[PDB]
Scaffold this active site. Structure first.
Site, mmCIF file in Angstrom:
data_model
loop_
_atom_site.group_PDB
_atom_site.id
_atom_site.type_symbol
_atom_site.label_atom_id
_atom_site.label_comp_id
_atom_site.label_asym_id
_atom_site.label_seq_id
_atom_site.Cartn_x
_atom_site.Cartn_y
_atom_site.Cartn_z
ATOM 1 N N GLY B 10 33.041 -13.998 -11.476
ATOM 2 C CA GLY B 10 32.834 -13.485 -10.232
ATOM 3 C C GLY B 10 31.713 -13.899 -9.651
ATOM 4 N N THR B 11 31.116 -14.909 -10.016
ATOM 5 C CA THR B 11 29.874 -15.616 -9.667
ATOM 6 C C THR B 11 29.697 -16.061 -8.019
ATOM 7 O OG1 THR B 11 29.906 -16.241 -11.968
ATOM 8 C CG2 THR B 11 28.011 -16.816 -10.703
#
EC number: 3.4.25.1
Lengths: 215, 215, 200, 103, 205, 213, 259, 197, 215, 197
Positions: B10-11
């Site tokens: 979830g960068t």
């Protein structure tokens, strides 16, 4: 391929006296997002064949690699034979059909232009393997928006000149940009003639929005 | 209760290229659903001495792909007795992602510096396509900063200017994106070397909130 | 589709219709549903026409190989068992085969029912197909082992005609066959309309 | 009974279309005008409907249409099925008792 | 399977010179099993007016009965024979009254004008879509075959007897290629002077 | 999901005669609601005495035609003779049943002269079952075309009629009329009609324009 | 009369108590189709008024049902509408709105306004939540000048100088985008609409047959039903003319009718 | 599962039905009569879904009895069949469908004998002979083969016996007993039950 | 072929409040799937003389809600014999959206000016919640400009500054969002009145693309 | 659908099975023998899913005959039952499960009579008496009621007849004929078929 992911909008091709011209936008859309706005969806197969794809761009790159390798190897052979555009069309049709039969198809619709032995070639290869040759072609929303104009002009005048074909392709690009959410202002005109394959740089359409003020 | 959730990075990954190098950046939040499994993770995985990569998507898949590509690139560099090119690492990542596009999801962008082409930034989103970009943003939180990076990106930015731009864009993403958070990790790669800095607390750029009194 | 087969004293009588329907539309009205395996062995066609034809032709070539190798004609039970094995090794693959193996061997008249499900059973009277119920009723009311050849022909014709009358997917003509010790013969091919004119 | 469950999602809405429209008008009046307008219209509708033909005879409801503003509006309801051509009519006394609430 | 194919049925109507013709099959059966070979699909809606209904048998009968109810009431109130156009409008209204759950039948109306004696043929859709064409109208489970036969055979200004020949040939060849339709064909030839009802010989297969 | 088959339209029709075997088809290649091209005959000539028509999924049609050509070349190389129409029909049936669980979405009609010089028409289903007929229509408008063929060529439901042998000119007129009707009532047909007449002299190709959509 | 136990008075309106039949029948095995008209309808706003266009092909399933279908519906002397989608739904919607507008004009004593018809159409369509499939192009010339609307089945409208509807709408709209001019002439507008309809006809399977036109202006209403006939049936070569006695009959019932 | 049969002669209508009422794999009742006495001249053979059969049959029976009481003359068999079809269609279109298969038989002093076939969809059809249930498939062929329009009462009984023997020979379910009734101009006469021990 | 798609506005709506009024803005593209049904639509629906609303979501739902709220607000203003408050219109929209949240989807933001509280901006997203915001953005394309508006928004912006900010943010959204496009329609509401302008072609702010030579 | 039954006595094992082979609603064969001769002292009563029954029964039969030929002595009934269970379990676990219900009966000169029960899951269980099919539900109660460990052969046949009569009385499916066999120390003896015309 199973998830199209980055996709292509549409490729329009039409054959004139002396060669064929194809056009495609420079946009690769993830979903509705533009994301990549400078990729090229047209490749030069050899001196007498061109190729444009609409669909998964990764599959387009894979086909680019494979076809370039075949052309390089055949040039290395140096036996005086060249892959005619019809041969490339047949090879692409076979590859797409095999991939479909393996339940892992390449998600691109391919338009193949070419000019060999004084004969303009314009091929269409679909995801499943549907292959045919037509004076004018259009993939994606092209078949609904641009194909009408191309077919009307051609059935009116059977044979066009280079300038006429280019103008018609530009009008089709303008219509597609007006009425296609996945289209992009910048497109790429590629023409193949006796001289060879000539791919023009990024070109923009002449937008018109008087109807916005008309209301 | 809150398990059976594959750990996804979830960068908000970002890589900006300047004259003679590339500036890399990412957050440090990995959320398993909505729980923050790790809040100080290192999303910048070094592939070689002067080549880095940013991992977005499934943590396990990106980690395995990065390890395999690092092994392959090290072996290749040893064989060639030359510093590896960033394009070579990008090609290896593209091949790995395209081969297993239906098996693993991994949005990886590769940035680094090589003697030949200098600082380069390559993006390999899900699907297995590779394209070189001056600046590349990816991950869940990248959607919230597309307009900001489009508006505030200039040509010929210096190293410190690129670092500041990356920090600002990343901080905006962390503020707006729930899956993004933690601290900003930066890595400026150049001929001299890679110097990494971590911005935490007041170091993270702060942008004034509306704070309308009635609300 | 309706097929009729019963073994009386003088041999085995085999009858079938000639209507093949692709859904509601009648694809053909002249399909020969009596598949001739050998000069002495023959089979029927119920269900998937392509499956029945292909597998019965495979059985025919296998029987010819058996005759060439062993220098003796293959028995009806043996051929039915081979067909059952071939259709069973492809079980669960969607094959829709319904056939009756009719022939004369050292044992005597032979009649075996073989389907794609796998079961293989011998009996006196058999009928497989959509209209098999009507032919079953007519034949059962009119069947007798001590029957003359003409009476058996009439019974088979009437059973097939009634099956076509009551079944929408059955019709065309009655392909009547008679199996004897010297080999099967083709008796007649009577149109259903002609039979309706005759009986009524 | 299973009859309570609508056969079509649109069936429940269109079966009570007039009731729902009157309810919406009353709600808008209450919101803007106040309590007086819905009460006044309810009393007027009750008075107009109280005078009509018996249940087994089809009524015109002209005053009701005028008050509801439908005297010059035609919808599918008025044309598709005619209450006059009922095709199903019960016993007169039975219907009258049912309306009166005995049955 | 399609609901129309549940009971089969095939109705055709054709137009000639100062004459109209309507024909239908006589088979009633559930799915594949036949029951009777005398089911009526053409109902008189006036002296020179007939309506043929193809589709679910129960829906056919219900629509015919309700249409007769409305027609009788209309003729009693007006005191005049209904016009073919008015009958078409009535059928369309009846079918649209059940729009969201429809009557599984596609009626076709054929008749002469009670006053002008002008031939009139029309076809209705599932939910009552009027469609008036001067050549012919067909409806049933063998629509494609009937369309082909009518297109290949129909000619303008047909002689009544030869109009009967044409419609009979079309219906016979269409039903002979359909499994759930056939078992006899009934043909009504409607003219101002008289009406001829004829039953054809057909394959009982 | 992914659908390996799509319907590209197309209607084929073959009529057998004493010394001729007409194989006719339309040139409309249409996928979905659009027309891919207006020039794509569905009839491909295999030998000097056999012409095959393919309708349905275009990719399967092309692959099957190429496989048939390759098998014809293999047969010529092995047996040192050209394959006969019945042999081609049997081979096509075997090929079609080979891919039984992934069936070819092709409607195949083989029309040509037999060893006796008589017109032979073989009709095929996607699975592979086939039989010899005097006339057959395949494709989208097969149901529309077949009844008139039965009425005229078969003289069915015609009481007190003369069973005149089918001549060549009558066959061509019948083919033109049936395809005109199909173009009128079927949206998948039109544009042009490619007629391949297989006679002992050779194969003649005739094109008749049909009304466009 | 009815038979026992009928309490409630009849409830006029739509009768939806018939979908349990549909559910049961579908559960038994796998619904028949209705004419969708495969339409191509287009309209433009030129200097003096509105020009509407339509095709005359109605398709049931994938088979042409009607070769000559009027798809330009009458709403008022100055207002006309074009229908696309389910044929019966568009027909009934247009007829109902036309009757309502007739009542409104009779009460008011003045020509109806296009905005009124658009409002009624969209309100009804929204009420029915798009279950009525009526893709409509509404055009007219009221006291406020020409107006053109595109009403979708769900109840969304949009006033535009040119609109297209139906399955062949994209080709017509491409023709418009290519060859549209503000403030066209009557002949130019008619030609543009005819070209758009012809493109839709020749490029879409669902569209075909003839071309309908309707020129609306503050002076005249010009309804041109056989405006153009691009496609026509070919000449029949062989004569399949059946002679008397060809068909064998079983029963004869001659019923004279009194005159 | 449940079998009905009806044969119409020149002046009579012979009807019969099995006497098996089975739940799951056990025959709970072996003498279950499925004939409902509509009136002195009309019978209603009803089979179908558990409670729908009895409820519908009794409802129509009480309606016919009410008609007789109010008017003083019984409904004609055609009128009774039309009334039953109307009610079945109305209920089936509604939210409480009746999955019942009907076989109405009756005699009219004007029209004569009449046999009416009705499926669960309420599609009325008058036929010389008809049957319901899975045994109809096996028995309709015999009826077609051996039926004559001018068939005597004893010949009709013999044909019925042939049909029942075929049912015992081929039908999977066991139906040892069949209740047989006939309707003449003199009324409804109960015949000896055909049993296959 | 491409039907059965409910027409969704797919807007990028924006409303910025300045000292003594509110600036409204939206694109003009409505896409039925991926086909642009309307490219010059007017997404700014006036509710009253000095109160406007922006429609996002299903076109029919938003249009019906706007019409109903306009009718109610006109009746209410006539009853009170006072100019309606923006908060009243916001409350009516909130009530309609909350009552039918499960029946209709409509993301509507209401901005206007009233004598009491001056310029106000209210947002009523799907669900039926109402909150006053200094600046509110909604629609499909709003996601791509969250960071930009967060970074480039100030306190005390003037009318022209707010107009420029709205134009820039909207243009970025149209460039990045496929569902957004057409022309920028602006409506500055103040005590004097509402002045509406349409930006087309060159008037739409242009932001330099990366245009990396290798790509 | 298909009924099996087995009663074990002091020095015998009485087994019987119906002779009905039905497809859909018609009894294609009314004399279908379901007993497979494993050896001179062992029988295998096999019912189940169409082709699985015959294939599995014949495979095990040929395996037992091969054992006899190679070794010269027959498999013991216990050994045969264990071998059958092993093969059935192996096939069930694999990609080609055999849905066959088995009832192995045999006599051993040392162990004596033995009856073995096996379901389609290959769960072996030796029991004094057992049954398969839907009739087992109706017949196991009678077996429990009237079974005695020291039951004579004639009494065992009488109990079998009681069970079959109950099947005719209550079971929906008709099973007129039952093939009855017994296994003694002298071998397998075929008894008169119990028929219920």
């Amino acid at each position: 391929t199973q998830n199209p992911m980055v996709t292509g909008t549409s490729v329009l091709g039409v054959k004139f006296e002396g060669g064929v011209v194809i056009a495609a936008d420079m946009l690769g859309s993830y979903g509705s997002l533009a994301r990549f706005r400078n990729i090229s969806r047209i490749m030069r197969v050899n001196n007498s064949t061109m190729l444009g794809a609409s669909g998964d761009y990764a599959d387009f790159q894979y086909l680019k690699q494979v076809l370039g390798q075949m052309v390089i190897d055949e040039e290395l052979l140096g036996d005086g034979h060249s892959y005619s555009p019809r041969a490339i069309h047949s090879w692409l049709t076979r590859a797409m059909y095999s991939r479909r039969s393996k339940m892992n198809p390449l998600w691109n619709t391919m338009v193949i232009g070419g000019y060999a032995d004084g004969e303009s070639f314009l091929g269409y290869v679909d995801m499943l393997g549907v292959a045919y040759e037509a004076p004018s072609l259009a993939t994606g929303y092209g078949a609904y928006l641009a194909q009408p104009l191309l077919r009307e002009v051609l059935e009116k005048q059977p044979v066009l000149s280079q300038t006429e074909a280019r103008d018609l392709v530009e009008r089709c690009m303008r219509v597609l940009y007006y009425r296609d959410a996945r289209s992009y202002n910048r497109f790429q005109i590629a023409t193949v003639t006796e001289k060879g394959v000539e791919i023009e740089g990024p070109l923009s359409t002449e937008t018109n929005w008087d109807i916005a003020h008309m209301i | 209760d809150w398990e059976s959730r594959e750990v996804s990075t979830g960068t908000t990954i970002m890589a900006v290229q300047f004259d003679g190098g590339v500036v890399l950046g990412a957050d440090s939040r990995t959320t398993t659903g909505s729980y923050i499994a790790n809040r100080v993770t290192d999303k910048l995985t070094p592939i070689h001495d002067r080549i880095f990569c940013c991992r977005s998507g499934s943590a396990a898949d990106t980690q395995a792909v990065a390890d395999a590509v690092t092994y392959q690139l090290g072996f290749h560099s040893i064989e060639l007795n030359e510093p590896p090119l960033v394009h070579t690492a990008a090609s290896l990542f593209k091949e790995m992602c395209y081969r297993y596009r239906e098996d693993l999801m991994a949005g990886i962008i590769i940035a680094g510096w090589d003697p030949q082409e200098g600082g380069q930034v390559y993006s390999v989103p899900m699907g297995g396509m590779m394209v070189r970009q001056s600046f590349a943003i990816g991950g869940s939180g990248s959607s919230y900063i597309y307009g900001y990076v489009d508006a505030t990106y200039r040509e010929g930015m210096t190293k410190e200017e690129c670092l500041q731009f990356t920090a600002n864009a990343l901080a905006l993403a962390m503020e707006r994106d729930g899956s993004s958070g933690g601290v900003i990790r930066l890595a400026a790669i150049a001929e001299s070397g890679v110097e990494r800095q971590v911005l935490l607390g007041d170091q993270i750029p702060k942008f004034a909130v509306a704070t309308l009194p009635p609300a | 589709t309706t097929t009729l087969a019963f073994k009386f004293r003088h041999g085995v009588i085999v009858a079938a219709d000639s209507r093949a329907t692709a859904g509601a539309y009648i694809a053909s009205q002249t399909v020969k549903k009596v598949i001739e395996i050998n000069p002495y062995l023959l089979g029927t066609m119920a269900g998937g026409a392509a499956d029945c034809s292909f597998w019965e032709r495979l059985l025919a070539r296998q029987c010819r190989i058996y005759e060439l190798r062993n220098k003796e004609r293959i028995s009806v039970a043996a051929a039915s068992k081979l067909l059952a094995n071939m259709v069973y090794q492809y079980k669960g693959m969607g094959l829709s085969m319904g056939t009756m193996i009719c022939g004369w061997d050292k044992r005597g008249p032979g009649l075996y029912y073989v389907d794609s499900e796998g079961n293989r059973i011998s009996g006196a009277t058999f009928s497989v197909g959509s209209g098999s119920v009507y032919a079953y009723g007519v034949m059962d009311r009119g069947y007798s082992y001590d029957l003359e050849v003409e009476q058996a022909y009439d019974l088979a014709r009437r059973a097939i005609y009634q099956a076509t009358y009551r079944d929408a997917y059955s019709g065309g003509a009655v392909n009547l066959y008679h199996v004897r010790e010297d080999g099967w013969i083709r008796v007649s091919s009577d149109n259903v309309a002609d039979l309706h004119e005759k009986y009524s | 009974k299973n009859e309570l469950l609508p056969s079509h999602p649109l069936e429940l809405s269109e079966k009570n279309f007039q009731l729902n429209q009157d309810k919406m008008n009353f709600s808008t009046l209450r919101n803007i005008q106040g309590l007086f307008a819905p009460l006044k219209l309810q009393m007027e509708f009750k008075a107009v409907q109280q005078v009509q033909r018996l249940p087994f005879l089809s009524s015109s409801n002209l005053s009701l249409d005028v008050l509801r503003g439908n005297d010059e509006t035609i919808g599918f309801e008025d044309i598709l099925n005619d209450p006059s051509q009922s095709e199903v009519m019960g016993e007169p006394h039975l219907m009258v008792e049912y309306k009166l609430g005995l049955l | 399977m399609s609901i129309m194919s549940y009971n089969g049925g095939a109705v055709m109507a054709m137009k000639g010179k100062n004459c109209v013709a309507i024909a239908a099959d006589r088979r009633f059966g559930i799915q594949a099993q036949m029951v009777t070979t005398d089911f009526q699909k053409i109902f008189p809606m006036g002296d020179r007016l007939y309506i043929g209904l193809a589709g679910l048998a129960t829906d056919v009968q219900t629509v015919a009965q309700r249409l007769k109810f409305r027609l009788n009431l209309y003729e009693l109130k007006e005191g005049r024979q209904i016009k073919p156009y008015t009958l078409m409008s009535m059928v369309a209204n009846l079918l649209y009254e059940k729009r969201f759950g429809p009557y599984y039948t596609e009626p076709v109306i054929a008749g002469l004008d009670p006053k002008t004696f002008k031939p009139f043929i029309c076809s209705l859709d599932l939910i009552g879509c009027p469609m008036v064409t001067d050549d012919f109208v067909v409806s049933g489970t063998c629509a494609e075959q009937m369309y082909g036969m009518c297109e290949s055979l129909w000619e303008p200004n047909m002689d009544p007897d030869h109009l009967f020949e044409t419609i009979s040939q079309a219906m016979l060849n269409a039903v002979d290629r359909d499994a759930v339709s056939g078992m006899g064909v009934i043909v009504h030839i409607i003219e101002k002077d008289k009406i001829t009802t004829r039953t054809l010989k057909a394959r009982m297969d | 999901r992914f659908s390996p088959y799509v319907f590209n339209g197309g209607t084929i029709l073959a009529i057998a005669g004493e010394d001729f075997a007409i194989v006719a088809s339309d040139t409309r290649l249409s996928e979905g609601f659009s027309i891919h091209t207006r020039d794509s005959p569905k009839c491909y000539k295999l030998t000097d005495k056999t012409v095959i028509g393919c309708s349905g999924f275009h990719g399967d049609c092309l692959t099957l035609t190429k496989i048939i050509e390759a098998r014809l070349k293999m047969y010529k190389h092995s047996n040192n003779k050209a394959m006969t129409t019945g042999a081609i029909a049997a081979m096509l049936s075997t090929i079609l049943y080979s891919r039984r669980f992934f069936p070819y979405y092709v409607y195949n009609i083989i029309g040509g002269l037999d060893e006796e010089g008589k017109g032979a028409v073989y009709s095929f289903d996607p699975v592979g079952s086939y039989q010899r007929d005097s006339f057959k229509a395949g494709g989208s408008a097969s149901a529309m075309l077949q009844p008139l063929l039965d009425n005229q060529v078969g003289f069915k439901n015609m009481q007190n009629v003369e069973h005149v042998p089918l001549s060549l000119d009558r066959a061509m007129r019948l083919v033109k009329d049936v395809f005109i009707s199909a173009a009128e009532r079927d949206v998948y047909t039109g544009d042009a009609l490619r007629i391949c007449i297989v006679t002992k002299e050779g194969i003649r190709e005739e094109t008749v324009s049909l009304r466009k959509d | 009369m009815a038979a026992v136990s009928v309490y409630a008075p009849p409830v006029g309106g739509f009768s939806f108590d018939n979908c349990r039949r549909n559910a049961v029948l579908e559960a038994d095995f796998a619904l028949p189709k209705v004419r969708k008209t495969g339409t191509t309808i287009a309209g433009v706003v030129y200097k003096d008024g509105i020009v509407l266009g339509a095709d005359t092909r109605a398709t049931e399933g994938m088979v042409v049902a009607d070769k000559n279908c009027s798809k330009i519906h009458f709403i008022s002397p100055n207002i006309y509408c074009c229908g696309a989608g389910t044929a019966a739904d568009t027909d009934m919607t247009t007829q109902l709105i036309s009757s309502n507008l007739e009542l409104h004009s009779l009460s008011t004593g003045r020509l109806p306004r296009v905005v009124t018809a658009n409002r009624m159409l969209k309100q009804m369509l929204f009420r029915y939540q798009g279950y009525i499939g009526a893709a409509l192009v509404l055009g007219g010339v009221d006291v406020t000048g020409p107006h053109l609307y595109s009403i979708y089945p769900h109840g969304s409208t949009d006033k535009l100088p040119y609109v297209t509807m139906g399955s062949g709408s994209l080709a017509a709209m491409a023709v418009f985008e290519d060859k549209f001019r503000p403030d066209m002439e009557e002949e130019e507008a008619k030609n543009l609409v005819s070209e758009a309809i012809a493109a839709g006809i020749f490029n879409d399977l669902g569209s075909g047959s003839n071309i309908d036109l309707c020129v609306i202006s503050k002076n005249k209403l010009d309804f041109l039903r056989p405006y153009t006939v691009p496609n026509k049936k070919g000449t029949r070569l062989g004569r399949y003319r059946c002679e008397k006695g060809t068909t064998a009959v079983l029963t004869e019932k001659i019923t004279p009718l009194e005159i | 599962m449940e079998y009905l049969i009806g044969i119409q002669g020149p002046d009579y209508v012979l009807v019969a039905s099995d006497r098996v009422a089975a739940s799951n794999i056990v025959q709970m009742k072996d003498d279950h009569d499925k004939m409902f006495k509509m009136s002195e001249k009309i019978l209603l053979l009803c089979v179908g879904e558990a409670g729908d059969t009895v409820q519908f049959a009794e409802y129509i029976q009480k309606n016919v009895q009410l008609y007789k009481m109010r008017n003083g003359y019984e409904l004609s068999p055609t009128a009774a069949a039309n009334f039953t079809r109307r009610n079945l269609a109305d209920c089936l279109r509604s939210r409480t469908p009746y999955h019942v298969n009907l076989l109405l038989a009756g005699y009219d002093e004007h029209e004569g004998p009449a046999l009416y076939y009705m499926d669960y969809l309420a599609a009325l059809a008058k036929a010389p002979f008809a049957a319901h249930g899975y045994g109809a498939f096996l028995t309709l062929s015999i009826l077609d083969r051996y039926y004559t329009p001018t068939i005597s009462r004893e010949r009709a009984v013999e044909l019925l016996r042939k049909c029942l023997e075929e049912l015992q020979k081929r039908f999977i379910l066991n139906l040892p007993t069949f209740s047989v009734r006939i309707i003449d101009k003199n009324g409804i006469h109960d015949l000896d039950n055909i049993s296959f021990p």
